[PDB]
Design a protein around this nucleic acid. Sequence first.
DNA 1: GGGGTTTTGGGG
DNA 2: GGGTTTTGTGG
DNA 3: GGGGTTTTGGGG
Lengths: 452, 217
Amino acid sequence: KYEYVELAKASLTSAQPQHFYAVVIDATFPYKTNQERYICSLKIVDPTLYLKQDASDYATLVLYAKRFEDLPIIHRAGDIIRVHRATLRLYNGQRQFNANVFYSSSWALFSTDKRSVTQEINNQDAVSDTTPFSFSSKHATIEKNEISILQNLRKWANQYFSSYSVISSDMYTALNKAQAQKGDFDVVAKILQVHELDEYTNELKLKDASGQVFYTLSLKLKFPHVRTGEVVRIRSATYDETSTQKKVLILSHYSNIITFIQSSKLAKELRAKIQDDHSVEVASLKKNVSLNAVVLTEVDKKHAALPSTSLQDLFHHADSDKELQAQDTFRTQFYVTKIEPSDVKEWVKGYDRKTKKSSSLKKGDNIFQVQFLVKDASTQLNNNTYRVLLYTQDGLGANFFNVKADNLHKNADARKKLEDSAELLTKFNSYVDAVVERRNGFYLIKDTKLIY
Amino acid sequence: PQQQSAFKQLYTELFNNEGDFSKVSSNLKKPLKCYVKESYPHFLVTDGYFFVAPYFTKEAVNEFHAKFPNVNIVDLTDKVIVINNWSLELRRVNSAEVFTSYANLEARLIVHSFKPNLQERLNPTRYPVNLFRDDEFKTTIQHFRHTALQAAINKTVKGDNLVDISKVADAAGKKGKVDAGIVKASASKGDEFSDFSFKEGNTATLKIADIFVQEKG
DNA sequence: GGGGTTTTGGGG
DNA sequence: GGGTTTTGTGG
DNA sequence: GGGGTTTTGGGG
């Protein structure tokens, strides 16, 4: 039987192991300190300790372990953690709870929202509202009397996050003032874009309330929950003074990227206030070489929720994988290495609806017949290039270039705009975000259009 | 604007000049004063911002063990060294095995001569990060590869072999294999792209383990 | 037996 | 404990 | 002292 105490009521004198339920509002990633020690530092809150008189008040929790796997990975703020056998002491004025997981202490994480982060990523349903989505040791036990504690704390957590910022202005620094910091700092920003730099790394394009844009590397394995349009808190970032071409934040092994529970007032306001910025892209288009990525296209709103499929799966597994075989419409990202036919003037051909044949626009029903040769992160090292078609005879991708089909041999205006788009598409660091439809072994672009 | 990291500027100019070390600015070929972060199992030195792995020639270590007796190299951790004679080469490697590289490409700092300064050498510096993990530098290497890829494809792909429109305009009773969209990027030998024009520098170097045995069997 | 932790020798 | 390992592209 | 474990009483 375990007796759970509230943060503010825990004993500072009795150095005896105490147990409690609390809401996590901040946490480092579990990190190693030497050869046999791992640590995770987090800030916790509850009905008796959550607000200084305005800024958010809190207690600290430090978990010590001998293995990485024995520590909790906090992907989201607002979830609940349960700790057993923690020793409380005062550390520089704050109530610090310490727990040696490598000995007799244990922890368990409970989802405040319907699903846990991982469950949201894998589209899984929670076993029950009383099941921990993660915990230390081989087992975890929740008694009947704990249910009310958990249900009441969740209700309180949502009230807290919906009526308070929780992560107050004193817990992070404005991006446009980052360069003035002597060391590391925290940030709260919206993810404007997630660029797949390579096999193991994502590049996040961030923008906070100050309007400044910054880029940062985010390992795919470490932070698999990063999503465009979402707000996150970054624990421990540093300003990169060696980056001249663009504003870059450097993260450390202990750094963490944390999202917010649905009820978060802060995340809701920032999600709406912070709007997409393309200033970096527009400026880079004036340089011969852009170290900044530029996504040239935008997919139709109805596909915004559709997951993306790599070129590796699209061309190498699409005829063998069960899941990919049952699908005919996919979303993918890639960069164009070359566009055929070479002569931009031949991009538009005359099409005969009856004989299913096309000819040089020296005659016919005008349509686009463009063949892009692409490549991506998943196929970066191989010796291949992949064909992606823009054959608009049936309407698919008819407005891709924002130029209606016309005889490019006669219409100088259209030819010029297409030629400019050609150079942009084949330019280094230019990428395409598009939806495709598989037909007779080929993928045709559709419901996709240039935004530059 | 101004590049604070000497290594970043050096390595970036090497890649932007097709691995030709003679094309890199001469005002950058001056003695390198760098702090030693690690000495074993990996010898890593920093320039105040990033860390790189120096590759010592057999001549460099013998000359070292002569002008500086008993002062072991594998114990230079947390001490500074001054590389007077060095060169930069571009090498094709397996990034999955070499962490000081990226995209199977590595820029090596060949060391010919270096002297240790144990004179309480200090310098408050930010935590050194792997240059081959830096955002901008990785991007520079991607530009390098993209340039080589594009030149090879524009030389290999010709004749405008466009998919016949009929194959996708009457696909009611037509089935096809997606691999029909795969096109070779160059005249290679294996499955990896290797059509580069920079001549892969050679130069013999010592394995960090041999220098450990030469000092402590 | 061996950890962590003090119980510092001995329970279930 | 607001920190720094290598497993050296979760750590 | 108490875990997990097997040592089933007794080390450091």
